[PDB]
Amino acid sequence: SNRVLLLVGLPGSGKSTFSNKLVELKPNWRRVNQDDLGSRKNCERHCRRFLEQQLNVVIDRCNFDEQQRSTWIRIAREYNVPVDCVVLTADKQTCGERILEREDHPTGVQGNEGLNILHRFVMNYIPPTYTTNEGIRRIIHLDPSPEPYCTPERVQSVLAQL
């Protein structure tokens, strides 16, 4: 049956990379991203509309602590569907290098922001684990690929683990 999929990762970890590919390859999947959907109230609505059509839904947000993820777990329970999770394991170094690549942040005294931003997220980042009392069915950790782009095989490999 259909299921809700939580992406969890630092800025620049590759969450959009992955979720975009998934929805491209699989038409029974939809993607909730705030850069495309705006407010959270709006994201919740879309999420509800997709579950109403028994579609799978993937949540492209840092989802950096229990509170952030609950929103979606809560909606999933509403439609009696499970919630799995994909944690991107890319480290502060990797993300930092990716964020510099984009060169769209102020830079100089008071630091290069974006590295700052990353640092702020890092300090509030609580990924799901065995112990957190959240009601997630399965947590899979995903390591970075050599390739900047996400292969169909990579998507398949992830989905194959529930």
Q: Which positions touch ligand GDP (CB under 6 A)?
A: 9, 11-17, 98, 144-148
Comparing CB distances to ligand GDP, the nearer of 81 and 159 is: 159
Residues 15-74 that bind Mg ion (CB under 5 A): 16
Residue 145 interacting entry, from Mg ion, ligand GDP, none, C-beta within 5 to 8 Å by type: ligand GDP
Comparing CB distances to ligand GDP, the nearer of 15 and 31 is: 15
Neighbours of 50 (CB within 10 A): 20
Residue 111 interacting entry, from Mg ion, ligand GDP, none, C-beta within 5 to 8 Å by type: none
Q: How far is the CB of 38 from ligand GDP (least distance, A)?
A: 16
| CB 73, CB 83: distance < 8 Å | yes
Distance CA 49, CA 71 (A): 15
Give residue number: closest CB to ligand GDP.
14
Comparing CB distances to Mg ion, the nearer of 9 and 50 is: 9
Q: How far is the CB of 15 from Mg ion (least distance, A)?
A: 5
Q: How far is the CB of 67 from ligand GDP (least distance, A)?
A: 19
CA 18 vs CA 8, 10, 21, 101, 109: distances in Å = 11, 14, 5, 18, 34
Distance CA 147, CA 144 (A): 8
Distance CA 126, CA 67 (A): 10
Burial of residue 55 (CB within 10 Å: 0-12, 13-18, 19+) is: middle
Residues 80-139 that bind Mg ion (CB under 5 A): none
Question: Of the listed pieces 12-20, 70-78, 107-115, 125-133, which binds Mg ion according to CB under 5 A?
Answer: 12-20
Closest Cα to residue 60, out of 78, 47, 49? 47
Instruction: Give residues in contact with Mg ion (CB under 5 A).
Output: 16
